[PDB]
Design a protein around this ligand. Structure first.
Ligand code: VWV
Ligand code: ZN
Ligand code: ZN
Ligand code: ZN
Length: 572
């Protein structure tokens, strides 16, 4: 218990006992904390509790130092000094924002705003506190037990009484009982196990509540600007394919860390892999939160980088399927592709962190703790989707508050901006450029004349809280009969329940906006489903319409976003 203060680093024996993370607080900061919050328990080698037998006084403001022990007002000896006096709490080696982070329930957007506008040490305290809160909230949910096994992909569940039921979607991953991780989609429910096991009745599922480790490293290391490219050796012979990013790869070698805002289809993966061709002797660790984002970088590296110097790090507890073409778990390879949670303790000449809007400050800090690099490159787009904040239910989380990297890209601007979209028909590029990019995203493709929009509110039904709009799926069914080229389209919507109904009626492959991020399809059929803050979110709208290479059909509920779509309007 000899540590450093989380607000001014002043060494102390004091730790707040009411805080879920028990931060070390100095004599002056422990006081401003206990005097302005319900948090009154103070800890050291021994807690600040009354030493008199059977006495339950633990409030530090009601306690005194009786020589070597602590006593309340009713038990203190004549020669006793209060623990709280002169703006200090008695201890060895003798903040409004710290109080709000220590006592908030993380259900409001203002909680996340603060966790990102506060000092660096408070961002790590905020990130452990939030993650610990999120993990103890997983215990609140009830146990699901297999009642009847219908087939190899359908079952019927029996839920625990008294405890709420967690939302049935791919967002929530259960642990079977240790028969492997499992997931469900909606009394006919679909069951998907990470490990193929002959489903037994009586075997139950519980959400994987993992221990929240403390954070040591900052979210962002302190910025360093250099006059020359440092520790990296460029090629003079640089492939014409990657010539557009040569000035940007040099900016990467002349700064400790750099930010790259890359709208959809502007060449983020190409920039990331081309940085390896530009610094060809440099050891690069490629990281992202999801296995899908690490795999998309693995796909781009298979096409340009030597496959024998590549390695895909897969955690021993292999959850879902991964990239198979690289030698697995060879930590020492020049190119290592790995998710943030599976990152080994290693060093690199460059660390590339992709899909930065999906990172949390907890993820940012983990990467700085496991990887010691000469250069760090953060690639993503703050106009794309952030990580789901399971506790947040009141207020909207704006892009400048997703993480430190996004906060920077939205305030001081990004260091590098990929300004030309090569994926989308110009109708889509023109819509999202005006919507989220201040008219600075340019269209490489021409207008495809295959981008359509329909204003159809339909009928909104609900499977618990996940929404369905059957008349919107019916309008799509009518459209498909008249436009059979759209047979190979991917169906996208903001709700998995709309996607389950569209899968059975249309037969199209189905994807939620959130799971479609970073993917591209020739044709996209999007039904807005509802007029909610979730379905009207401009970042989600931006991701939804930028998945299409050739054509898109948008069946809209919101007049604002429908009027903003620079598409050909249809009728029926
Ligand atoms: C030369 C400086 O360029 C930028 O900062 C790029 N900026 C364009 C408008 S945006 O897409 O809204 C935010 C990114
Ligand atoms: Zn302090
Ligand atoms: Zn506290
Ligand atoms: Zn007492």
């Amino acid at each position: 218990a000899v540590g450093a203060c989380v607000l001014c680093n002043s060494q102390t024996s004091l730790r707040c006992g009411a805080c879920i993370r028990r931060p070390f607080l100095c004599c002056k900061c422990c006081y401003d904390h206990v005097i302005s919050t319900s948090h009154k328990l103070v800890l050291s080698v021994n807690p600040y509790v009354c030493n008199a037998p059977g006495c339950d006084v633990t409030d530090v403001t009601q306690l005194y130092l009786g020589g070597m022990s602590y006593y309340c007002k009713s038990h203190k000896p004549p020669i006793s000094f209060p623990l709280c006096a002169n703006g200090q709490v008695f201890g060895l080696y003798k903040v409004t924002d710290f109080n709000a982070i220590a006592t908030c329930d993380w259900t409001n957007a203002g909680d996340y705003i603060l966790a990102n506008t506060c000092t660096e040490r408070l961002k790590l305290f905020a990130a452990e506190t939030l993650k610990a809160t999120e993990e103890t909230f997983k215990l609140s949910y009830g146990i699901a037990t297999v009642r009847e096994v219908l087939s190899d992909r359908e079952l019927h569940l029996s839920w625990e009484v008294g405890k709420p039921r967690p939302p049935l979607n791919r967002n929530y991953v259960f642990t079977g009982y240790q028969i492997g991780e499992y997931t469900f989609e909606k009394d006919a429910v679909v069951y998907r196990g990470t490990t193929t096991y002959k489903l037994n009745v009586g075997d139950y599922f519980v959400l994987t509540s993992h221990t929240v480790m403390p954070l040591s490293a900052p979210t962002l290391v302190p910025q360093e600007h250099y006059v020359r490219i440092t520790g990296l050796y460029p090629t003079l012979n640089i492939s014409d394919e990657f010539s557009s990013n040569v000035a940007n790869y040099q900016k990467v070698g002349m700064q400790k860390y750099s930010t790259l805002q890359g709208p959809p289809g502007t060449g983020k993966s190409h920039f990331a892999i081309g940085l390896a061709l530009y610094y060809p002797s440099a050891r690069i660790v490629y990281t992202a939160c999801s296995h899908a984002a690490v795999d998309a970088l693995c796909e781009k590296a298979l096409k340009y980088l030597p496959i024998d110097k590549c390695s895909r790090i897969i955690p021993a507890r292999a959850r879902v399927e991964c990239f198979d073409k690289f030698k697995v778990n060879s930590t020492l390879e020049q190119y290592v592709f790995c998710t943030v949670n599976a990152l080994p303790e290693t060093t690199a000449d460059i660390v590339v962190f992709d899909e930065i809007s999906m990172a949390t400050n907890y993820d940012l800090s983990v990467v700085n703790a496991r990887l010691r690099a000469k250069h760090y490159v953060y690639i993503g787009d703050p106009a794309q989707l952030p990580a789901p904040r399971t506790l947040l239910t009141k207020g909207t989380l704006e892009p400048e508050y997703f993480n430190s990297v996004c906060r920077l890209m939205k305030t001081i601007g990004p260091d590098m901006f990929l300004g030309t979209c090569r994926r989308c028909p110009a109708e889509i590029v023109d819509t999202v450029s005006a919507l989220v990019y201040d008219n600075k995203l340019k269209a490489h493709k021409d207008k495809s004349a295959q981008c359509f929009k329909m204003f159809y509110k339909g009928v909104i039904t609900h499977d618990v809280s996940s929404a369905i709009n059957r008349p919107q799926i019916g309008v799509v069914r009518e459209f498909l009969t008249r436009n059979p080229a759209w047979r190979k389209a991917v169906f996208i919507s903001p709700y998995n329940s709309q996607n389950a109904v569209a899968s059975k009626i249309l037969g199209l492959p189905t994807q939620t906006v959130d799971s479609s991020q970073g993917s591209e399809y020739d044709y996209v059929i999007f039904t807005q489903t509802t007029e909610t803050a979730h379905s009207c979110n401009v970042n989600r709208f931006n991701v939804a319409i930028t998945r299409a290479k050739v054509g898109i059909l948008c069946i809209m509920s919101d007049r604002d976003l429908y009027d903003k779509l620079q598409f050909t309007s249809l009728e029926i």
